[PDB]
């Protein structure tokens, strides 16, 4: 299931992020993904004397299920699903809606 | 219309449950008359499976109301059957 890979534009579908797009930083084993500036969190950082703590609130990014996000086809300007086919050399993923090839 | 079907009245009873609830109360003539070869004789009795398996004794005992004019041969025939079976037109002889 390599539908979502690294360095790809994805748009959320459900939950506090309808419409907003972003770039996937990476993916996790459980399927959760990280996209910059999509679900901001105000996590509080416990004061640690060592490790050179910057100090204060830290604005990091939380984890969002892959289901809530889908690859956005900028060519058609609309969210669409993906499929797989065999080419001469290897296998690559292609969008739906007339089968745009990446 | 599955939720429109009920059983007959009086066919279901919950039954008693002692304790629970203080206020809850507490060979003949008719035989082998027509069996496709029901001739009165000692043979075929075992095959027909009408009188046990090891039963050999046979009799044509009757109780009035003669309704099967069947002729009897090969069995114990006496004057008694003469006055009863013949009333229906049948013949009885040894």
């Amino acid at each position: 299931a390599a539908k979502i890979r690294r360095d790809d534009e994805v748009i959320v579908l459900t939950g506090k992020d309808k419409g907003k797009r972003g770039k996937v930083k990476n993916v996790l084993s459980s399927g959760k993904v990280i996209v910059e500036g999509i679900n901001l969190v105000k996590k509080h950082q416990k004061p640690v004397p060592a490790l050179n703590q910057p100090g204060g609130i830290v604005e990091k990014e939380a984890a969002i299920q892959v289901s809530n996000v889908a690859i956005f086809n900028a060519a058609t300007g609309k969210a669409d699903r993906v499929g797989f086919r065999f080419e001469d050399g290897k296998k690559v993923r292609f969008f739906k809606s007339n089968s745009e090839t990446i | 219309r599955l939720n429109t079907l009920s059983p007959a009245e009086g066919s279901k009873k919950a039954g008693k449950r002692l304790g629970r609830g203080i206020g809850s109360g507490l060979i003949r003539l008719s035989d082998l008359a027509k069996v496709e070869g029901g001739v009165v004789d000692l043979n075929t009795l075992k095959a027909a499976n009408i009188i046990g398996i090891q039963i050999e004794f046979a009799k044509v005992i009757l109780a009035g109301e003669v309704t099967t004019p069947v002729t009897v041969r090969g069995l114990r025939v006496t004057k008694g059957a003469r006055a009863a079976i013949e009333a229906a037109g049948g013949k009885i002889e040894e």
């Binding site: - | 219309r1 599955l2 079907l5 009920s6 059983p7 007959a8 066919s11």
Partner: protein, 186 residues
């Protein structure tokens, strides 16, 4: 009585006593409950103090973590039904269905190809949404393209389940299927 196919005006005569008998509520109740009991699966058991891990009494059911005073071994709830009673129930249910005009008959209900879209379009033309489809000889083109439809079922004459006739509001017959069911039921 004569039933009009409403497609070719080829009504087929049927025995009056078969589709004209009075609706016997008790017989249908008995057959339905017998079938439901037969559907039961005998999978249930527990351990008594005799067969409860431990030693002794501590294992007595009154004591906590003990056995069950009223343990029941697995059993089968199915009960046999007389063949004549089953035939009478089938005749009564068929008579009741035809009396209220919930039974539909056509000369032949077949699909040229195993395409669910064609079947859905045909059903829409028939103005039927949740109905029972029953015919004679099995058709792969129709049977294959009917499983996905939960509210649409296709079977053969030998598999006429009496309870199934109640779940579906309407039943669709076939010219050969009617004759087959009439001759087999007798």
């Amino acid at each position: 009585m004569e039933l009009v196919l409403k497609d070719a005006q080829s009504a087929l005569t049927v025995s009056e006593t078969t589709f004209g008998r009075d609706f016997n509520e008790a017989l249908v109740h008995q057959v339905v409950v017998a079938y439901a009991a037969g559907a039961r699966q005998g999978t249930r058991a527990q351990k008594t103090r005799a067969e409860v891990t431990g030693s002794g009494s501590i294992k007595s059911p009154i004591w906590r973590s003990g056995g069950v005073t009223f343990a029941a071994r697995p059993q089968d709830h199915s009960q046999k039904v007389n063949k004549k009673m089953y035939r009478g129930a089938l005749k009564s249910i068929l008579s009741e269905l035809v009396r209220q005009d919930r039974l539909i008959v056509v000369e032949k209900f077949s699909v040229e190809a195993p395409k669910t879209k064609l079947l859905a379009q045909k059903l829409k033309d028939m103005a039927l949404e949740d109905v029972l489809i029953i015919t004679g000889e099995l058709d792969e083109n129709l049977f294959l393209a009917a499983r996905n439809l939960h509210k649409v079922d296709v079977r053969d004459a030998t598999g006429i389940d009496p309870v199934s006739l109640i779940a579906f509001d309407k039943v669709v017959m076939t010219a050969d299927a009617v004759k087959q069911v009439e001759e087999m039921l007798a």
